[PDB]
Amino acid sequence: ATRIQAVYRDTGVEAYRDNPFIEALPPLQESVNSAASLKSSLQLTSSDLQKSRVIRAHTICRIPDDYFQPLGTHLLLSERISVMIRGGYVGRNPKTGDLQKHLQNGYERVQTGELETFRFEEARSTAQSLLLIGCSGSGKTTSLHRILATYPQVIYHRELNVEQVVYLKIDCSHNGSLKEICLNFFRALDRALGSNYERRYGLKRHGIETMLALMSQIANAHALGLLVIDEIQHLSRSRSGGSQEMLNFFVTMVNIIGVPVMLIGTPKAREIFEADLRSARRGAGFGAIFWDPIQQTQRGKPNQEWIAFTDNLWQLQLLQRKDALLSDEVRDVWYELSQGVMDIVVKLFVLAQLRALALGNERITAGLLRQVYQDELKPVHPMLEALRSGIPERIARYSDLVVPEIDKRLIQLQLDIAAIQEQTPEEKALQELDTEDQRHLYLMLKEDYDSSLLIPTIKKAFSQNPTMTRQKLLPLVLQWLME
Amino acid sequence: TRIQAVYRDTGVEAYRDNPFIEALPPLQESVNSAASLKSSLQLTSSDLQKSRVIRAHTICRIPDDYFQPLGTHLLLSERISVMIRGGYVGRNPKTGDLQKHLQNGYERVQTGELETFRFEEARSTAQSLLLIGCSGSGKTTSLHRILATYPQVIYHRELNVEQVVYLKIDCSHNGSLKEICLNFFRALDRALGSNYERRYGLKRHGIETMLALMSQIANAHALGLLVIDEIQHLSRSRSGGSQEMLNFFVTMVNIIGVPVMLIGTPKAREIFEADLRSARRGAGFGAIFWDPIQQTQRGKPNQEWIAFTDNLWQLQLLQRKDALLSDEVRDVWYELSQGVMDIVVKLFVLAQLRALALGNERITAGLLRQVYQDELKPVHPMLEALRSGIPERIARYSDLVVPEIDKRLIQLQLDIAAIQEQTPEEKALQELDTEDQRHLYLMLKEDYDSSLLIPTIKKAFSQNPTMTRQKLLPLVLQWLME
Amino acid sequence: ATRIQAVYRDTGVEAYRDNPFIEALPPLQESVNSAASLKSSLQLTSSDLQKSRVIRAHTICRIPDDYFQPLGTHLLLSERISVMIRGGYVGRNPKTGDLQKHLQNGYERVQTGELETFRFEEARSTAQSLLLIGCSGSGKTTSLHRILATYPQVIYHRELNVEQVVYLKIDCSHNGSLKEICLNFFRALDRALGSNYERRYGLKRHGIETMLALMSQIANAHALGLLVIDEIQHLSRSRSGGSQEMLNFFVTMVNIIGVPVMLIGTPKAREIFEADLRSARRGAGFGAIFWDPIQQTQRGKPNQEWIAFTDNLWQLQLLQRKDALLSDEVRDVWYELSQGVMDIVVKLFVLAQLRALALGNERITAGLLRQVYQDELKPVHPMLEALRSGIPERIARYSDLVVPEIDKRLIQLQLDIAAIQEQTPEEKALQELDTEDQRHLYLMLKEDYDSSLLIPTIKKAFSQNPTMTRQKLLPLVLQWLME
Amino acid sequence: ATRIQAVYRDTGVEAYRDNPFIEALPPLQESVNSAASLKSSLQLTSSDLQKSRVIRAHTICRIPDDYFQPLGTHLLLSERISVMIRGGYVGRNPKTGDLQKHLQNGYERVQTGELETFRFEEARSTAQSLLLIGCSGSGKTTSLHRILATYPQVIYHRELNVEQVVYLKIDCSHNGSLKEICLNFFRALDRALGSNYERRYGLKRHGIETMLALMSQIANAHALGLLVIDEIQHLSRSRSGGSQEMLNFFVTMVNIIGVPVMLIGTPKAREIFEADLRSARRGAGFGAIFWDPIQQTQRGKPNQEWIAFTDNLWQLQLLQRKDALLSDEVRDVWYELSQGVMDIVVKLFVLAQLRALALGNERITAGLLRQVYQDELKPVHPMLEALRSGIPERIARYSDLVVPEIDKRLIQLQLDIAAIQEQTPEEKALQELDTEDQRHLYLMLKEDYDSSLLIPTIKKAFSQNPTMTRQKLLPLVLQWLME
Numbered sequence A, C, D: 001a002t003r004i005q006a007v008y009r010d011t012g013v014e015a016y017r018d019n020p021f022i023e024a025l026p027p028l029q030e031s032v033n034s035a036a037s038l039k040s041s042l043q044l045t046s047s048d049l050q051k052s053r054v055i056r057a058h059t060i061c062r063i064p065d066d067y068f069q070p071l072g073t074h075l076l077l078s079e080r081i082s083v084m085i086r087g088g089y090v091g092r093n094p095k096t097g098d099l100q101k102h103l104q105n106g107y108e109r110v111q112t113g114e115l116e117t118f119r120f121e122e123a124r125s126t127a128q129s130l131l132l133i134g135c136s137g138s139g140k141t142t143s144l145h146r147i148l149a150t151y152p153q154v155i156y157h158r159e160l161n162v163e164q165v166v167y168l169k170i171d172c173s174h175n176g177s178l179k180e181i182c183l184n185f186f187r188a189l190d191r192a193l194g195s196n197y198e199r200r201y202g203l204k205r206h207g208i209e210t211m212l213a214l215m216s217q218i219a220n221a222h223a224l225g226l227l228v229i230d231e232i233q234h235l236s237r238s239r240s241g242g243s244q245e246m247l248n249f250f251v252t253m254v255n256i257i258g259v260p261v262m263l264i265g266t267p268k269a270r271e272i273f274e275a276d277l278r279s280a281r282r283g284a285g286f287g288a289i290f291w292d293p294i295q296q297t298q299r300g301k302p303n304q305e306w307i308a309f310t311d312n313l314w315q316l317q318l319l320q321r322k323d324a325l326l327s328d329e330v331r332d333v334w335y336e337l338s339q340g341v342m343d344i345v346v347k348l349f350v351l352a353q354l355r356a357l358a359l360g361n362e363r364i365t366a367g368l369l370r371q372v373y374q375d376e377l378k379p380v381h382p383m384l385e386a387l388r389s390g391i392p393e394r395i396a397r398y399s400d401l402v403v404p405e406i407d408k409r410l411i412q413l414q415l416d417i418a419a420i421q422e423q424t425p426e427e428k429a430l431q432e433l434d435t436e437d438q439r440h441l442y443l444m445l446k447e448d449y450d451s452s453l454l455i456p457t458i459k460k461a462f463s464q465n466p467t468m469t470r471q472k473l474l475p476l477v478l479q480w481l482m483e
Numbered sequence B: 001t002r003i004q005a006v007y008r009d010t011g012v013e014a015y016r017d018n019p020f021i022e023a024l025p026p027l028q029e030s031v032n033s034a035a036s037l038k039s040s041l042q043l044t045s046s047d048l049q050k051s052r053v054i055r056a057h058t059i060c061r062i063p064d065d066y067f068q069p070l071g072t073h074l075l076l077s078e079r080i081s082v083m084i085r086g087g088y089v090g091r092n093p094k095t096g097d098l099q100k101h102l103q104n105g106y107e108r109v110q111t112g113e114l115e116t117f118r119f120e121e122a123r124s125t126a127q128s129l130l131l132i133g134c135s136g137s138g139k140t141t142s143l144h145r146i147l148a149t150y151p152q153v154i155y156h157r158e159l160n161v162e163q164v165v166y167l168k169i170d171c172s173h174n175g176s177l178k179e180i181c182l183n184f185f186r187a188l189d190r191a192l193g194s195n196y197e198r199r200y201g202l203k204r205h206g207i208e209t210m211l212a213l214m215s216q217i218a219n220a221h222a223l224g225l226l227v228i229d230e231i232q233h234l235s236r237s238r239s240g241g242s243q244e245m246l247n248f249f250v251t252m253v254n255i256i257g258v259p260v261m262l263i264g265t266p267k268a269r270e271i272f273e274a275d276l277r278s279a280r281r282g283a284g285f286g287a288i289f290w291d292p293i294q295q296t297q298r299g300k301p302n303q304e305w306i307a308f309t310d311n312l313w314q315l316q317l318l319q320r321k322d323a324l325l326s327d328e329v330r331d332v333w334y335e336l337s338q339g340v341m342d343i344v345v346k347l348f349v350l351a352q353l354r355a356l357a358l359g360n361e362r363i364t365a366g367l368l369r370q371v372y373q374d375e376l377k378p379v380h381p382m383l384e385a386l387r388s389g390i391p392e393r394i395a396r397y398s399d400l401v402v403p404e405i406d407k408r409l410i411q412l413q414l415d416i417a418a419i420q421e422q423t424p425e426e427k428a429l430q431e432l433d434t435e436d437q438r439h440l441y442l443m444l445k446e447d448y449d450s451s452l453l454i455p456t457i458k459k460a461f462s463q464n465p466t467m468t469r470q471k472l473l474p475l476v477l478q479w480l481m482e
């Protein structure tokens, strides 16, 4: 817990003035560019490629979990979360009276006192609930985990005696029930704070009503900012009951708890909320934000976003015979085969390296991509063909495919490439130099100039000029290279 | 929302000692009841200088928080007040000496000194009103804002009743007569804290059994109004025809003592036009009609249109703004929107949302015409029918509405957010287009410093076109070094 | 009842150290020596006899309220209250987190090897509930009220932000149920603390199961020292659940809340709890203290307790022709008349004194006492005869009987007293003598010498005595009267 | 208790090598060193001597609840409990994942002909059982809530999801029904894990066989380690069936359920198991332990255990007039009246101290011991006389006697000690008067003159003059008072 003494700032908005829970948050000015400052990528040096195959394979296997590239939706979602969190605190000011007394005083002052008019609207504050919908693998969880890391989870105050829980995350389990969510709420709260609410409130004897009341009480004890319930797809409609009962429980939970609630799910989870979204009555809530794959055709032009994403990842290939330019057909094949879904796009790039490391030459070709698509990514065929077809019901049915058990498959592929003793000509050429630190110059000089006299002339020149930097001897080698 | 009751007197002699009527906000004149509904956004000059995404969000937040009270809301407010306060006169629970009074009256009529007597005042008048008008005219927001003045639940200390003042129901997209009964309980256990839906809304019950169960509950808490919204959405095939809906809506008024209000589209009146059972019961208190705004009702143009357009125009967030609104712009709005409330606001919002994307940042007639042509496609026949003026064509296309407008707003925001990136770096690489140059830059990015590396090589390429990449390396390296 | 800033003193006991809650309580040593100093009495003056009938009747009317004699059981109950209140704060010291961290730390330290052994004994200190059983009218409620008034109800901590509630009391009503107990807890908490919890939690939606959890959370929030449920005899038996459901509810309430709990009831309510405390299990809790009537005899001798109580009550005689000392016959018949019940002992005396004053033959004797017994105590005959019979089963059935509506009878008898106008010979002499000092002399010398020479001699003597007090005047009149 | 997170420690035995359940338990200890870990005593021995009598009585009443001293027979029981708990976990190893491949490889090799013999799997047969027999009052439960108090009850495993219930304790009922033994298992498992087994299984109408086949399924999901059944005497043909089914139920239970079972009973409960070789084979599966009272001497010289038990308890004496050392006559009388039963030794001490406080004598002699033995220990006399006799049959027939309701006697004695009175000097000065005349004169002349010399003057008036009437005495009394 980043327990920091509450240091209070000045906010431009008059509504957020003198609220001790909002000045404790990081300022907006530094959060303007923090949304776009989420970029993170691996750093590669020249000597990494010259090293042995095991470390190169390890670095290749480290790619999927160490690469992030933000998009426009990562900015829109960041701004939405910031405004939601900062607007959900306006009603819960400890320095001002509660809502019910305000309403009662207004009623007395409009009937007995002097006041021309009043608005008996719910003072519950904004509390804008939201529902995030997207196909599996689009990159929803990995975006929440990166845009919710700016705010510290727990902030401690000293003028009062409270502990502010800025956000809380609940992750569902497969084939769970409604009561499992209630248990997980207390479990996550005890993990975050270090309390013992689970023992005295998370017993299995309690009914749903008692657990909901206790959740409301405890969430109003510690000032809670946001509640995120992830992976709604795993809930089962057999034991829980009808889909109407699930919606009733979700609406009851949202109304009682009194804090902003965000739900993340797939289109298969939309059939539960279909009746709620279409109704236009205020108070139903659950605004919808849809995550979509990167469509290459916008306004009759290739996307600058698509090429920007592909070029950066194309710069991150560890190949001996790699092609610097990404051709139009090479760009098009691994879009038309993967349909732009976020995980499959990087899955091809990480798996084609492994396939090429054993199947022959170290070059990425369309045939190799087709072969890896056909032999490895078997379960995800219906989802990809549904996305290619473009019929919404077909995509809705064939979603949730997550190509199970890729973690063990990566390890098995690593073990498979581990037991290879054949020597490539490139390995022989690299071994012909005894770590003289000159295979780097040889690397820039191998793609065009022939190797008939490349290495002997290089060795002769570096022997003639023993102690200078490689930048100095590169013109020296080039002087007699063509003469 | 549990508000304790505070009693105040009213000048009406018919409501002398009624707690239900005396625990309500006081009676008001014409000016305040119509001027209390006004609401608008407040903007500051600091909002003008901000990032484009926040400005787009503020623009998209306009239709939710803007309301202008016209001259047709005063009548609706007055009628709703009369309906709510007049339906409680026969339901006051203060009956202290009824038994002795009735017994004395009976003992006196038998002897012969008293000719006649009235044992029970059967105050059971069925009051109702139906409000029909074209879609997009604002029958839902104009009702929410009127009803947001009374408290919903009032608690009386002396008694044990919870006076649920009003209740609102919305119909489903296909809909049947059973689901209205199922939604009554589902909204009543949301207004209060209860579990009526599981206890009473079973499947074993028929339509009549739930219709009779609703009466006991609506008389347990002194319900004051019942609003059924969007009767246009009901399907005439899953309900029983065009007659069993009318029978349902006429039997509903008689048994349930509360006043009811029915809201629909002009093509949904064909259900209700068959008989007096809703031409008299439904129009037991009139039938208010909503119409689009007319530009020139008299010889002079209407001041309502001018005031509405001016007040809408004063919420513009653009660097290049024109304070004076041109007459041609007014003509363009009246020609494209034809006075429908839902079209004017969307046209304005979409125009000033596309202005940021195109970068002009000024609203012109051509932009409004283009956004009307591009975005308002499904609602064209309704506009044409309103322009023609034939009642049948107006009735037939009265249910048109543009689908998926919110997704369009989100996509329009995303396009601007993608555009916003200035990209000060990589500008020289944008200037770099030749394949040989890009390969050379990739080769020499680590060796040299790119900032002065990129511009220099373009001159060398421009001077001598008939040179290859391989042979250019020594000369380019020599020029870079010295 | 009013907020008091906490003042931290020092306690000599080692276990009650560094605890904000215990040190803020009143000091232990001062309370020890003042446990038997709660004795109160309605003081009388020598001049009170000389005033009229109405004023003296009004003065006699105040005896049942302005009198309290501390008996043996009062000290034991005081000690039990003290230990129960101050022993339940050991496990809730704010300086240390809780016992779970202690248990985990001990487990880790014994697993590592630095600690030989650890006792997972579930340390809870005393943590014992108490059950009070006694016949109606024994005087439990008054003693409890007078012993709980020493501790201030609410003390405010400024260094912390908690509201210590030292005790809380709940009073039942006729034919009540459990939900009234749950709601009355909140109502009493609002009346004592000064905030509004009834309007937020007193909702008809909640069942009793959820209300108990809310009670537990709120009580743990405020550090509730002690909970006293009173007059459980009044609530109906079969209206709620019968016998098993009420016992189950009481056990659940005792287990969940975690603060000391006391119950007060009649022997007729003991059969609810007979199934629990009779089992030979010292860890089941529910210790019992039995209240018993005062016994005249002890190991063959009259106990000093009853004799001292009767003497102190007889010291307050206010009557015209009353006797001086207490006779053996009247004292012995008083035991058969009242049988030791606290209410009957004082009420018989008050009623007999009032009747003697009203009759005009004011001298309380055995016959007047018996007449009052058979006149006013008709309803409570079965309880008295069952208690005198000594059958342990019949006393339980009639233990709930109580004298109905006696307050109105006192007013009616006072109105009857005000109606009389006849003048007794003592009142005739009172009208004859103007000086109150002379009236006292007449009163003390009334029985030895009759008014044949009494009134004239003292009248002329005090008339001729110009100005002097009684101290030397009385000896001077003695020889003149004797001559 | 409570969900303690597991921390693994290695075990030196080869067979316990890789079992999480065995490793999460507290480390192995030597038998001699483990028996000394059970000792406990009161810490208030000298600091609390000078205080009021009721507080001292309240302190004394807690001697038989917090004083425990191990004997030489506890180390064997501790070793047996440890071996029984840890040795029943070898067949329940959860951490195995290479079974399928190994079994299939063995099958292939034995089918081809490379390998001759193989062993696939074997089921477990029977669980260890133990029997403990001894007379009542010997300490078979106080000495076993402390052996099992050095273990956690519930342990949570992070990598798995099992909650290892280390042990569980249930008691038989007076009815002896076989359906209330399968119904306390669920209740005791619910009172520890906070689960809902009793509603799901017990309340439905199931046969004893079906409900016994469900007790071995929830004792496997939670890796239960030991099951203790107390008061096994109550199945001696008490009710509910015939002897043959009552004997078949235990055999089927031991055969079915996988956990070890321990049985505790009275010397009249070996007739149940001494009926056929199956019952005596299963009751004495891991030895049988028979317990006997303490003897004064074994071979000539007196027992040292008696000396150590009657010397570490005599120190806990809160009396002003105590003796430093034990007179041998007092100890001999104590052994004559106690005969070695654990319960009688403590009670003859606490009751003697309470009577000493009540009567005002602050020292303990043999007379008080004999008086308490004759008065307050009537119901257990046949057992003590049979033990003194020496005939084994009379000892065996009276091994079930127990004294009921001694806590009520303790409370009554505390009340008697509380009600002693203070004898304030003014009341005793008034009590010095021995006639109605002196009291009459004092009451007549109390207010006029000071009471500092009133009593001596009145006493001297009657002392100097033998007797004469009060009316003429009063002029002399006032003359003496004035001068």
Ligand SMILES: Nc1ncnc2c1ncn2[C@@H]1O[C@H](COP(=O)(O)OP(=O)(O)O)[C@@H](O)[C@H]1O
Residues within 6 Å of the ligand: A064, A065, A067, A068, A069, A070, A071, A135, A136, A137, A138, A139, A140, A141, A142, A143, A342, A343, A346
């Ligand atoms: N904007 C992005 N830039 C780079 N990689 C991304 C991006 N979004 C998602 N990914 C990759 O997609 C992979 C899988 O995403 P995942 O968290 O499984 O999405 P979901 O939880 O919706 O299935 C992650 O390993 C992550 O590296």
Ligand SMILES: Nc1ncnc2c1ncn2[C@@H]1O[C@H](COP(=O)(O)OP(=O)(O)O)[C@@H](O)[C@H]1O
Residues within 6 Å of the ligand: B063, B064, B066, B067, B068, B069, B070, B134, B135, B136, B137, B138, B139, B140, B141, B142, B341, B342, B345
């Ligand atoms: N008087 C008004 N002033 C401003 N906006 C209005 C007014 N009346 C309606 N609107 C706009 O019309 C939009 C839709 O109206 P709605 O209530 O949906 O009408 P209907 O229910 O008949 O379709 C609302 O977003 C609201 O902003």
Ligand SMILES: Nc1ncnc2c1ncn2[C@@H]1O[C@H](COP(=O)(O)OP(=O)(O)O)[C@@H](O)[C@H]1O
Residues within 6 Å of the ligand: C064, C065, C067, C068, C069, C070, C071, C135, C136, C137, C138, C139, C140, C141, C142, C143, C342, C343, C346
């Ligand atoms: N020690 C005492 N001295 C004087 N009066 C007493 C004493 N104990 C009880 N009383 C009398 O008992 C009455 C109250 O009895 P109460 O406590 O209500 O009995 P219960 O609790 O059984 O209903 C008071 O009016 C009081 O005068």
Ligand SMILES: Nc1ncnc2c1ncn2[C@@H]1O[C@H](COP(=O)(O)OP(=O)(O)O)[C@@H](O)[C@H]1O
Residues within 6 Å of the ligand: D064, D065, D067, D068, D069, D070, D071, D135, D136, D137, D138, D139, D140, D141, D142, D143, D342, D343, D346
């Ligand atoms: N080793 C011991 N030291 C001191 N007291 C003991 C010891 N063993 C037993 N006792 C006493 O024996 C009393 C009764 O034991 P109990 O649990 O009733 O055994 P059982 O149930 O076999 O009769 C307890 O109060 C306890 O104080």
Ligand SMILES: [Mg+2]
Residues within 6 Å of the ligand: A140, A141, A231
């Ligand atoms: Mg996910």
Ligand SMILES: [Mg+2]
Residues within 6 Å of the ligand: B139, B140, B230
């Ligand atoms: Mg509408």
Ligand SMILES: [Mg+2]
Residues within 6 Å of the ligand: C140, C141, C142, C231
């Ligand atoms: Mg009472």
Ligand SMILES: [Mg+2]
Residues within 6 Å of the ligand: D140, D141
């Ligand atoms: Mg026992």
